[PDB]
Amino acid sequence: GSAHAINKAGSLRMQSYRLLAAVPLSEKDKPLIKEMEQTAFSAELTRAAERDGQLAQLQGLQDYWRNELIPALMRAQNRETVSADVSQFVAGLDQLVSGFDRTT
Numbered sequence: 273g274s275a276h277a278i279n280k281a282g283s284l285r286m287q288s289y290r291l292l293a294a295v296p297l298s299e300k301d302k303p304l305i306k307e308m309e310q311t312a313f314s315a316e317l318t319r320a321a322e323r324d325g326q327l328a329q330l331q332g333l334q335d336y337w338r339n340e341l342i343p344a345l346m347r348a349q350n351r352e353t354v355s356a357d358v359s360q361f362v363a364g365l366d367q368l369v370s371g372f373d374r375t376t
Contacts, residue, residue: 274372277320281365283311288341292358295348305342312337326371333364 287308294301311317312334321330341361348354 274320274324274374277317277372278369278374280311280314280317281369284308285362285365287311288358288361291345292351292355295345295351295354297346297348308337320372321368324372326368329364329368329371333361333368336361336364 287304291297291301291304291308294304317330318327321327341357344354344357
């Protein structure tokens with residue numbers, strides 16, 4: 273029953289690579305950040321995390337997005353160090369997907 277939640281996680285992976293490719297960010301990238309925020313706090317991602325006992329892991333990714341990843345992407349002048357932060361966020365999404373019940 274996790275299919276949709278996994279689609280949302282895949283979307284977050286794509287959106288983080290998209291924002292990294294836009295570094296250094298400017299006014300025109302604000303819509304990307306907004307879209308990513310709406311996806312990260314999606315009601316379904318939350319309900320799925322709840323039924324599969326992953327709520328803490330989901331809240332952790334949300335906290336990292338707001339307190340570490342976006343701040344670093346806003347500050348970056350080049351992709352040099354923030355690239356590794358994007359990689360860690362994607363690794364975290366892969367772990368979240370692993371924990372969902374993916375059975376028929």
